[PDB]
Design a protein around this ligand. Structure first.
Ligand SMILES: [Mg+2]
Ligand SMILES: [Mg+2]
Ligand SMILES: [Mg+2]
Ligand SMILES: [Zn+2]
Ligand SMILES: [Zn+2]
Ligand SMILES: [Zn+2]
Lengths: 111, 118, 290
RNA sequence: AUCGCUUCUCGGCCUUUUGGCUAAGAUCAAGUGUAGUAUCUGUUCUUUUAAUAUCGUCCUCUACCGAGGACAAUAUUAA
RNA sequence: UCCUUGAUGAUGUCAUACUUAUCCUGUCCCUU
RNA sequence: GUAAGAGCCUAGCAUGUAGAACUGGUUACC
RNA sequence: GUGCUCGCUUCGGCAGCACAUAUACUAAAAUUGGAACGAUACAGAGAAGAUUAGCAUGGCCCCUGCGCAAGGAUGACACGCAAAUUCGUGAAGCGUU
């Protein structure tokens, strides 16, 4: 049972975020839904995250408000994780602590 | 294709300790050596369940609540210059008391972006 | 999985003629010859001039097929697996290809461990219906000639430097120009083309059996070997089982008894049940048609 | 009007369809010359000398066999 | 009843034209 | 333009097994 | 085998008693199968033009490593004529009760 060490961290976070969204949309759909359409909502969530990072205002013209609110909720959660990781690595790069070179490039790109 | 999501996890019950100890292997990690082989228990002064059982928690909780509220209560030449005093009554305008649930409009983030970009 | 069981599943002509047996238990000694998952090896000496036999297959591979773990013959009748499956049905269908074999093994072992641990798991309901021809060629006395040391392969080349101290036999090996000498382990286990089973079923084909009426509807029974120490009022009681019994002609000068029943079916039956089997008044009662 | 077959139009199913993540993961550029491969077009086989290399007999060694030496022409190419 | 076996040469090869796991580049012209 | 089969294509490491089956039958009435 | 026997009774034999009490995966084998790179031809490395860092995910895929480290081409594979329950309109032509 492999450990999430240092190079699995973002892939494990984005692995678990998808699972939480899957459980929420399986609980959120009412009783007579065809139980398809999970992949499309996951793509809407990935596109909403890209539009958050690009500072593009994200609005789908027809979309149910529980799905739209849930996507906004999880996009705010990934925003918080992204931003707090950026603050932490910037304080580390400022003090001179042991940092990777890739985390310096990633941190510049986030800042 | 190659790049694909999951849509189902890997199930447990088929490796190293799951049903027959994976048929009794002779392989063991360095994290699986004996370590902390003695459970520490709560002593009589700490919070042992003999002492927790007879205690009335509501009276002590109300007393500590009262003491905390009481502590918080007892704690609390060139006159010709073209611009006059611009800050008259600005008594520091307590932004540092506010806490905002927004990582872009927080006070810590505004201090961050003020510090780290010139 | 492993196996890890106590006291193997043995017959009596492999376990020796001594009531006092020493055996050793090795915990995960060998692998199964069929299952290839390792088991507990039990090893004993049968007698005095015997071979030190040991168990060859798991407890599970003997639970599935009701055999002894070293000779792979039946526990109850003592015949090969192909003969007993010939005198019964064959609905086990254990897979022989690899991954299917281990998958079926895992699942049937789960079914065993989800039970008491005493019965043949699938062979029980078909083991209720028994007493076919296999009871009429089952070996009565133990065949202690299996428990016998191998031919000394230094003596075959005439170089046995141990001589009289060699525990291996100085006698003839069997001619390989013989169907009886191929004998795979798995062929003997799965009931496929076992030549011992071929000879036993051939012996079986020859054997006496109840036969059909010469002409239609005839329920006439020609009974030979009556004897004059019996009475015809008991026959009826031992016969009524079948149905209302038709004609009952009696002749004590030839000691032959003719019988008649309502249906020919019942007469065939009485042959079947009756032929080469029935004895009453401690005296064999022989039957024929016409 | 009803039942059946055949044109013709249209509605609903058509997530049966975009199968992750990171610093939009990153970057953003060419010409000439040779060599190799493939395709197309045109036309060929079978029935003396120079250079290089190396079975018989004899001799010696060691246990009929093996090794070493010498000797007797042979093969290729061109007119 | 066309005949009716124990099997050591056959189709090629060469030349020209069009696109690389090689080959060499860090590189420029032209008029008022 | 190097481990990726596939196959080949030749190998090599485990095994010291289990097992040998042969026996037979009578006939009679108006 | 050894010792003791107020054993016959000689130093020969025999008798009695005592102690001593079950090795061996039984082969110097016969067999039986699956297997060593690696050579032989072929074969050529993911991300919607090209050149490319990678991190994962899943399990009848493994290799190196003591590794719950990290590598193995992002280790390989994954590339799918991606069809799962259950239908109706309108006129138009033809035959029919
Ligand atoms: Mg890796
Ligand atoms: Mg790469
Ligand atoms: Mg991988
Ligand atoms: Zn077994
Ligand atoms: Zn047995
Ligand atoms: Zn011998």
């Amino acid at each position: 049972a492999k450990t999430v060490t240092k190079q699995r961290v973002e892939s494990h976070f984005d692995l678990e975020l998808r699972a939480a969204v899957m459980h929420d949309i399986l609980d959120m759909m009412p009783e007579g839904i065809k139980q398809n359409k999970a992949r499309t909502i996951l793509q809407h969530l990935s596109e909403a995250w890209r539009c958050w990072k690009a500072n593009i205002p994200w609005k789908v013209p027809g979309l149910p408000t529980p799905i739209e609110n849930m996507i906004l909720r999880y996009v705010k959660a990934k925003a918080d994780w992204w931003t707090n990781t950026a603050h932490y690595n910037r304080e580390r790069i400022r003090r001179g602590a042991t940092v990777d070179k890739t985390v310096c490039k990633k941190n510049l790109g986030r800042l | 294709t190659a790049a694909r999501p999951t849509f189902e996890p890997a199930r447990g019950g088929r490796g190293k300790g799951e049903g027959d100890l994976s048929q009794l292997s002779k392989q063991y990690s360095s994290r699986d050596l004996p370590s902390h082989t003695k459970i520490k228990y709560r002593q009589t002064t700490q919070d042992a369940p003999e002492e927790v059982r007879n205690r009335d928690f509501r009276r002590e909780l109300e007393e500590r609540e009262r003491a905390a509220a009481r502590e918080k209560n007892r704690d609390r030449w060139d006159d010709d210059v073209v611009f006059k005093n611009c800050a008259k009554g600005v008594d520091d305008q307590k932004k540092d008391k506010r806490f905002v649930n927004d990582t872009l409009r927080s006070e810590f983030h505004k201090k961050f972006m003020e510090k780290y970009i010139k | 999985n492993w196996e890890d069981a106590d006291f193997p599943i043995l017959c009596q002509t492999c376990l020796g003629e001594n009531p006092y047996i020493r055996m050793t238990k090795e915990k995960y000694g060998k692998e199964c010859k069929i299952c290839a998952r390792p088991f507990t090896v039990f090893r004993w000496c049968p007698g005095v001039r015997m071979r030190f036999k040991k168990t060859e297959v798991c407890q599970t591979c003997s639970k599935l097929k009701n055999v002894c773990q070293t000779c792979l013959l039946d526990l109850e009748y003592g015949l090969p697996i192909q003969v007993r499956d010939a005198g019964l049905s064959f609905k086990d269908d254990m897979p022989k290809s690899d991954v299917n074999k281990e998958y079926y093994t895992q699942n049937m072992e789960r079914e065993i461990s989800n039970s008491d641990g005493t019965r043949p798991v699938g062979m029980l309901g078909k083991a209720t219906s028994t007493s076919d021809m296999l009871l009429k060629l089952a070996r009565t006395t133990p065949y202690y000639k299996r428990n016998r040391p191998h031919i000394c392969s230094f003596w075959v080349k005439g170089e046995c430097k141990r001589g009289e101290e060699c525990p291996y036999r100085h006698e003839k090996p069997t001619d390989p120009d013989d169907p009886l000498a191929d004998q795979n382990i798995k062929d003997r286990y799965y009931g496929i083309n076992d030549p011992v089973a071929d000879k036993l079923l051939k012996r079986a084909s020859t054997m006496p059996r109840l036969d059909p009426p010469e002409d239609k509807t005839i329920t006439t029974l020609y009974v030979g070997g009556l004897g004059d120490t019996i009475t015809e009022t008991d026959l009826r009681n031992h016969f009524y089982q079948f149905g209302e019994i038709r004609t009952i002609t009696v002749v004590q000068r030839q000691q032959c008894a003719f019988i008649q029943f309502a249906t020919r079916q019942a007469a065939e039956v009485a042959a079947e049940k009756s032929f080469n089997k029935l004895i009453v008044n401690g005296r064999r009662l022989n039957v024929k048609w016409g």
